[PDB]
Curated annotation (Swiss-Prot), chains C, D, E, F:
This is B-phycoerythrin beta chain. Contains two covalently linked phycoerythrobilin chromophores and one covalently linked phycourobilin chromophore. Gene3D superfamilies: Phycocyanins. It comes from the Eukaryota. It comes from Porphyridium purpureum (Red alga). CDD domains: PE_beta-like. It is a peripheral membrane protein. Light-harvesting photosynthetic bile pigment-protein from the phycobiliprotein complex. (2R,3E)-phycoerythrobilin 1 binds at C82. The modification N4-methylasparagine is found at N72. Heteromer of 6 alpha, 6 beta and one gamma chain.
Amino acid sequence: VKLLNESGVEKLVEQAGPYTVFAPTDDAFAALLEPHSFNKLATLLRPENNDALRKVLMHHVIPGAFTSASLMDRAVTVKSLAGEPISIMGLNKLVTAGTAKVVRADVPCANGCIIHAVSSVIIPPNYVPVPQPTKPVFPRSVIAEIAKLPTPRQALGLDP
Amino acid sequence: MQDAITSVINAADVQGKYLDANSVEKLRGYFQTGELRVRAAATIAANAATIIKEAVAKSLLYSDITRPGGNMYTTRRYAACIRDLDYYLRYATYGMLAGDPSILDERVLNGLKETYNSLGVPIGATIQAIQAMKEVTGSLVGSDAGKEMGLYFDYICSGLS
Amino acid sequence: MLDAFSRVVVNSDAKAAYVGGSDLQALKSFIADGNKRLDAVNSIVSNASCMVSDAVSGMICENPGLISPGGNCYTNRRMAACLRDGEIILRYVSYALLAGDASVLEDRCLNGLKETYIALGVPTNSSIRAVSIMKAQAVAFITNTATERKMSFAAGDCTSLASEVASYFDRVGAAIS
Amino acid sequence: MLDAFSRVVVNSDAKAAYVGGSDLQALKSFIADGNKRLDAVNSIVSNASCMVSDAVSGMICENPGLISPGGNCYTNRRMAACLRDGEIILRYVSYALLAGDASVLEDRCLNGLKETYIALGVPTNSSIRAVSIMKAQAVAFITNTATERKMSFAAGDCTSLASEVASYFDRVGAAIS
Amino acid sequence: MLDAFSRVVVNSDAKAAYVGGSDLQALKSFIADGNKRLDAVNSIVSNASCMVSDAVSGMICENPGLISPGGNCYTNRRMAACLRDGEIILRYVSYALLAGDASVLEDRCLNGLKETYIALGVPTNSSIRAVSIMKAQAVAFITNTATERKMSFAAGDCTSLASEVASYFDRVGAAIS
Amino acid sequence: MLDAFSRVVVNSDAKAAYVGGSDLQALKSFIADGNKRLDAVNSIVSNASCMVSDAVSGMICENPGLISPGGNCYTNRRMAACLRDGEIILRYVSYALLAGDASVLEDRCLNGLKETYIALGVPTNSSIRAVSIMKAQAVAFITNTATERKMSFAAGDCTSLASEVASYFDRVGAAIS
Amino acid sequence: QFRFIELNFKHFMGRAPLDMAEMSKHYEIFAAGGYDAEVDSYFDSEEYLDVFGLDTVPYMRFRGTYAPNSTFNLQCRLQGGWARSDKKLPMMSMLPLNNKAAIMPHQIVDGLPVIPNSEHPSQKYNVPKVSREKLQRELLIAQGKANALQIELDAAYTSLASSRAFLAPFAAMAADMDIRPLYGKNPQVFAGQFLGVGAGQWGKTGADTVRGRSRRVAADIGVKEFQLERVKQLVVDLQRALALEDAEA
Amino acid sequence: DVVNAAYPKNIKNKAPVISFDGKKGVKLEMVTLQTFAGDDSEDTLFDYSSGKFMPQKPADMGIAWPSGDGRQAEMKGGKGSFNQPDLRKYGPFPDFLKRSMDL
Ligand SMILES: C=CC1=C(C)[C@@H](Cc2[nH]c(/C=C3N=C(/C=C4\NC(=O)[C@H](C)[C@H]4CC)C(C)=C\3CCC(=O)O)c(CCC(=O)O)c2C)NC1=O
Ligand SMILES: C=CC1=C(C)[C@@H](Cc2[nH]c(/C=C3N=C(/C=C4\NC(=O)[C@H](C)[C@H]4CC)C(C)=C\3CCC(=O)O)c(CCC(=O)O)c2C)NC1=O
Ligand SMILES: C=CC1=C(C)[C@@H](Cc2[nH]c(/C=C3N=C(/C=C4\NC(=O)[C@H](C)[C@H]4CC)C(C)=C\3CCC(=O)O)c(CCC(=O)O)c2C)NC1=O
Ligand SMILES: C=CC1=C(C)[C@@H](Cc2[nH]c(/C=C3N=C(/C=C4\NC(=O)[C@H](C)[C@H]4CC)C(C)=C\3CCC(=O)O)c(CCC(=O)O)c2C)NC1=O
Ligand SMILES: C=CC1=C(C)[C@@H](Cc2[nH]c(/C=C3N=C(/C=C4\NC(=O)[C@H](C)[C@H]4CC)C(C)=C\3CCC(=O)O)c(CCC(=O)O)c2C)NC1=O
Ligand SMILES: C=CC1=C(C)[C@@H](Cc2[nH]c(/C=C3N=C(/C=C4\NC(=O)[C@H](C)[C@H]4CC)C(C)=C\3CCC(=O)O)c(CCC(=O)O)c2C)NC1=O
Ligand SMILES: C=CC1=C(C)[C@@H](Cc2[nH]c(/C=C3N=C(/C=C4\NC(=O)[C@H](C)[C@H]4CC)C(C)=C\3CCC(=O)O)c(CCC(=O)O)c2C)NC1=O
Ligand SMILES: C=CC1=C(C)[C@@H](Cc2[nH]c(/C=C3N=C(/C=C4\NC(=O)[C@H](C)[C@H]4CC)C(C)=C\3CCC(=O)O)c(CCC(=O)O)c2C)NC1=O
Ligand SMILES: C=CC1=C(C)[C@@H](Cc2[nH]c(/C=C3N=C(/C=C4\NC(=O)[C@H](C)[C@H]4CC)C(C)=C\3CCC(=O)O)c(CCC(=O)O)c2C)NC1=O
Ligand SMILES: C=CC1=C(C)[C@@H](Cc2[nH]c(/C=C3N=C(/C=C4\NC(=O)[C@H](C)[C@H]4CC)C(C)=C\3CCC(=O)O)c(CCC(=O)O)c2C)NC1=O
Ligand SMILES: C=CC1=C(C)[C@@H](Cc2[nH]c(/C=C3N=C(/C=C4\NC(=O)[C@H](C)[C@H]4CC)C(C)=C\3CCC(=O)O)c(CCC(=O)O)c2C)NC1=O
Ligand SMILES: C=CC1=C(C)[C@@H](Cc2[nH]c(/C=C3N=C(/C=C4\NC(=O)[C@H](C)[C@H]4CC)C(C)=C\3CCC(=O)O)c(CCC(=O)O)c2C)NC1=O
Ligand SMILES: CCC1=C(C)/C(=C/C2=NC(=C\c3[nH]c(/C=C4\NC(=O)[C@H](C)[C@H]4CC)c(C)c3CCC(=O)O)/C(CCC(=O)O)=C2C)NC1=O
């Protein structure tokens, strides 16, 4: 709820459309200290990268009211309000949302919306982590680069 | 729906008191500022359309929430705004005359933030519009009258938040 | 195990109905894109041995505590077993992309794999990374946007088959989490 | 993890770019050393898969009665749970190193932990040894004085970040003693 | 200061080597395109009074708070010292375009410029979007694609001189960032 | 020595005092058992951060109520201030060990400390508990009887300096009592 | 000796060393002929007599153009504050001139002469006497508020760039139309109020009377850059007191 | 309280940091060696608050509405002369719920 309030995504899931939120408990957020997952998600801790934070939180909102009872051995996909598809897979009473492994079944909400508690944070499929802030580097000199470009007489094999 | 005078009767009735002489404190200004509030409500009635045209051009219309996809794109949706901003500038005028913001939450604030979340209206841009509308209202009515009319604008912005 | 044909059988068995004309359009469209699916499995099987070495070593260069002593990729039996279960998982996903339903993925591959990896002491955080690098390769091979090997395919679209194999690897990553 | 700093919102329809009324002043002032802090948490969690196996086996080789039959780490359910509690403690230390305060450590992890271990029969005098190995492990990474693994960094100083993370590890160990 | 030929000497002085035969192949193609370089700085210096008045008064079109009271371009002493500063930046960029090397821009102009502008109260974000209007003006004057003034050149291609003077202008905005 | 040590120690401002070769042998002739004594303070200050982070934490390891909410090693500014005060007494013991007198430790570091710790609400029994740990370490480091480390010294006896460093630590506890 | 070469650029020429090359020349003029050869290097110069002549006492020069930019910051570090003497100060300029130590922006504010009007007048005298630890907490809070105010000013610049691309197919499509008005340009037609503009309607600025999507997000930029510049001038005098919290310590 | 004149403005200067750099001299420095600080106080010295501000909402008065019936959170003066007290109590209420005195 705090990330929603800061990131401005919370206005979106205020709306009356029937949503199926997969809100991760903070043990899931506390479980973001993977050596692996910290690579692709730590860069969002920077205060300018609210841009991807909406795009990663908006992957947890599903248009429609998918209760766990509605997932009796059914595998149906859908895209989020982020814009990319997510596969909800309920088999053997183990309902999955990407890499969710849902903990608590459903929570009935106001506008016919449902809330499922997940064990991890779903990263969108074609999400690349933002690079760290770097140094704008400038070519040191100009004769090391004319010497870096192949002349036309080189391209025809006239020269070495 | 109580004014400054109602409020004192109304508070002072419920403990059946008569007025406890201090009680009139507020009342005794209130009548002192009675001349200021009418002239403040006078010019605001005259420049109602001009104030709302100044606020939206200074705040809100300078970021999407005018372009396609933004919350204010279609002409029905744009026309709902100036209809919607008219109530804030109008009901704030009522609070400025009555000297008590009871009319705002009675007729504006209750079910308001719960309604914008239903429609998906951005509360952030709404308050900015009222803040800009508060800024132009201090232009017309002056400093202290703007302090009075401005005192009910942020009351709307606070509860609407 | 089931497939894309027998999934709508046992769904139509639950309503005790016959497989009528409103459900054959889910299947006749599936067979009409049957040549696209067979061209989609063949991008995986033709790079199946180099994808598992691409992915387990990418788990090592992000999480270097596995090759430290006391880790879980330390010895040669432990490294070769981690090259085994990168491709055994890839063996069942390539069955489940071929069959069109994830029943083989959820009764043979994931048949208590979370109970295995706890009892083996395998770190489950690193095996999410080894599965998901194979997810990021398979959506580049099916869409033919791998940066260093292009295969010659007839033009069209495979965003459905790329998003189907992206839901099979997340299925694996949901259950061993 | 993502609550440990403050991200600014700039677009419309947010509610927090306009009406939010606060920039977080105590967290806008923690990115003022924040490049030094994010490298320090990157030292731990890129070695945490090696840190938990070194520390748990450190108290086995210093006290061999825990893998004795009748000891508290003999069964495979108990050996997996002892490896799980070391990683979960190491993550919540890495929360509190990242967030800069030990409130999240003493709320989710340390609250009701001494009452847990004396109800389960977990030995507390051996469990504080396993934390204090990880106290000695984490100061070697942040000062980059570890023996068999170095990491590249920018040039500078990282004392009072190793000294900050030594202040969380005894805070774990005194809450369970 | 250095030029393009003093730059290749101090690289060769670092290894105590003679400027041989293979690295004279690139120096002879610098001097062969030296007539386009003089034909390019002549299209900047000829237009240089209107370049810093299209830029400073285009900075005001994106920020009316500069010409509000208290503002940075508010009074006549302050607008005159900003039109002075906008053509110092255009003077040292044209020196480095003429010299072939940006060493005269980095120590005589851009060194210490950021904390100069903090101390006087100059908004550094308005300077970055002022020198980026001059960046787009210069690359329209090199490539002869300005809409209101065309100059008469010989036929050919000066795109490498356009992105050399573009890199001298985003070297300014990296210093006052 | 003292002259230029005191000169930038209590005798004046913040210099340092670099001591050279020909000034060294005059100091070693002046200081009795100087080749043992310059190994004695080298066995302390090369292990300075290891000795503090025991001794602050070992106070919490015996008194766990200080990091309770309401204790004084709660609220991380106060926990870091206890670790700076533990580092100051460890340093100022070693200058008294270097100069051979407790005079400079008393006036600069120790006078008024008893009124200071009762003005801040510092529990003054635990500070004697903290410096008794540092009393126990410095007799072990000087005699090379340390547990996990041993130092390569010239062979001999240093029990007379180890009793001399015992006579500095209890003067702290006699003052803050 | 290092302090003696520092003041000779200040006391006689009225500036700083321009770079380390000019300062290392004057150690060779001292190596040749000593004190009176090094002192006569300034008064027998063409830069002396073109500025001061034979009649004016030397002074600290605030010219405009500064052929190194780093020599402006160094002359405000050297001659800073009206009541400040040069007695028992340390040496200040070797590490700025070799790009080792950057000059802090509060040490340039002490050197500059005081203007009447600032946008943000300084709290140099209005900081309360609190401890060293509460000054460190109030500095790191104000540095954090300035970092979040920067990255919502950058989001305002991306909205200005998106507002111009929204209207650029029509901004250039109306640039080759024939838009002829009815009045306002030639004086033979009755224009009424619009001979110029009429009676107070020009505004406080002139740009506030212009309507448009890109003018309306520009006024959002000017109110967002005011709050960043207010808190960037608040970390200067929080730091400067830090210099006197430490320099006197 | 600052009783610390006995600890003057040369407070945490830390004289005995000693670095031997081999077999040579001891090279005593004077480095202050600050902590992992943070200096935790509220309401610092300046505002640090640009615009963005409309956070104030009044307190919840229960089920009535905020600030409407404060006539029980009320205020004093005479209670009149012929008021006589009550027999049953039915102790004190959350402000007679919605309608005010002037309904
Ligand atoms: C998204 C993830 C993310 C990170 C991992 C860090 C990575 C990171 N660290 C630093 C920059 C730095 N990092 C360190 C830290 C260290 N150096 C040492 O020698 C110590 C061993 C170690 C501390 C544990 C130091 C000392 C600097 C220099 C800047 C400073 O001191 O503030 C910089 C700035 C580079 C520069 O400008 O020079 C970056 C991007 N920041 C991020 O945003
Ligand atoms: C039904 C589906 C199916 C699988 C998925 C695999 C997975 C699998 N791997 C191992 C066995 C192992 N598996 C691993 C694997 C790993 N450890 C790591 O650090 C990495 C995260 C990961 C590789 C990517 C290792 C290191 C062992 C060795 C344990 C041992 O030798 O006892 C075992 C126990 C077998 C045995 O040792 O007898 C199984 C069942 N095999 C299967 O039959
Ligand atoms: C630090 C260690 C490190 C590595 C070893 C590589 C490993 C690696 N490669 C890819 C990403 C990929 N990896 C492969 C794998 C291969 N390419 C082929 O053609 C063969 C089949 C196979 C090598 C034999 C493919 C096809 C992609 C997709 C992009 C592409 O190569 O076109 C990814 C996922 C994207 C990412 O997170 O970067 C990773 C981790 N990257 C690293 O960061
Ligand atoms: C025995 C083994 C066996 C196979 C390997 C496949 C071989 C195969 N692939 C396609 C045919 C195709 N394959 C693709 C697929 C793709 N094209 C792209 O540009 C994408 C990169 C990729 C998506 C995954 C498309 C788009 C067609 C043509 C349209 C279609 O068949 O539906 C066809 C039909 C056209 C033809 O005659 O070639 C056949 C036989 N079928 C088999 O029976
Ligand atoms: C959020 C914080 C958090 C924790 C700190 C742990 C704390 C914790 N540990 C255990 C449970 C356990 N914890 C241990 C661990 C140990 N016993 C030993 O002898 C060693 C000293 C030590 C490993 C280093 C063991 C062996 C069990 C199982 C006890 C049993 O089943 O008999 C349990 C009971 C439920 C379970 O089985 O997991 C809990 C809540 N879990 C949490 O959720
Ligand atoms: C009898 C059994 C026995 C063990 C199993 C080991 C385990 C072990 N290692 C360390 C001590 C340490 N352990 C590590 C950990 C590591 N070093 C690395 O290079 C890897 C990344 C990582 C292991 C995977 C580090 C960095 C130290 C600090 C000392 C050092 O620099 O090596 C300690 C604490 C010792 C101390 O504090 O003095 C222990 C018990 N030692 C033992 O005596
Ligand atoms: C009213 C508000 C107002 C504005 C918004 C700006 C308009 C403006 N003009 C230019 C851009 C320019 N300005 C010039 C300058 C000139 N053209 C000539 O032919 C003359 C020789 C010379 C004036 C003396 C040139 C050459 C360009 C580049 C565009 C082009 O013509 O190709 C840019 C740069 C785009 C960027 O940010 O990258 C902007 C914003 N000026 C204003 O006044
Ligand atoms: C070597 C290279 C070199 C430079 C780059 C300039 C840098 C520079 N600019 C100014 C001085 C100034 N610079 C500005 C500039 C601006 N305010 C704005 O609205 C814009 C964002 C911006 C440029 C258009 C103003 C307004 C002053 C005067 C301050 C005032 O009196 O209000 C000064 C102080 C000059 C003095 O007063 O003596 C210096 C050193 N000078 C140099 O010698
Ligand atoms: C004293 C002042 C002085 C000058 C202004 C230049 C004048 C100048 N420009 C060119 C000649 C030229 N100038 C250009 C440059 C351009 N043509 C374009 O189409 C682009 C718009 C622009 C790129 C910047 C080209 C392409 C040639 C001809 C080829 C060449 O000289 O390499 C030449 C002929 C050289 C030759 O052909 O051998 C001369 C003398 N030289 C001077 O001595
Ligand atoms: C050169 C000589 C020298 C010293 C001897 C110390 C003495 C000292 N300690 C503290 C200050 C302090 N000292 C402690 C220390 C402790 N409290 C405990 O619970 C533990 C028992 C013990 C640490 C082991 C704490 C907690 C504070 C901060 C008090 C507070 O901020 O609430 C202060 C600051 C007081 C102030 O600012 O007014 C001083 C001067 N510092 C010096 O510069
Ligand atoms: C820099 C490396 C370095 C170390 C780590 C320590 C290691 C160390 N600790 C102690 C000695 C001690 N060390 C500790 C510290 C602790 N004990 C506990 O109860 C906890 C496990 C831990 C706090 C977390 C304590 C409490 C003593 C005993 C002090 C006493 O006599 O009461 C001794 C003295 C033994 C002797 O002199 O023979 C030594 C060498 N010393 C060093 O030079
Ligand atoms: C330049 C800096 C400098 C130092 C750091 C010390 C170090 C030092 N000490 C001794 C020499 C010695 N050092 C010791 C000290 C000790 N031996 C023990 O058995 C104890 C454990 C320990 C006491 C703490 C003794 C006993 C001698 C021999 C007697 C003496 O020379 O005083 C020697 C001469 C060894 C040789 O001849 O090769 C040196 C270099 N002296 C210096 O001049
Ligand atoms: C899809 C339906 C739709 C419409 C029509 C629409 C109109 C619209 N017209 C606007 C402005 C404007 N529109 C005009 C238009 C005109 N001036 C003239 O002389 C002509 C008579 C006329 C055009 C033919 C002008 C001058 C402004 C700017 C007014 C100002 O800056 O105050 C604005 C505010 C700025 C902006 O966000 O673009 C909106 C939202 N929005 C919509 O969603």
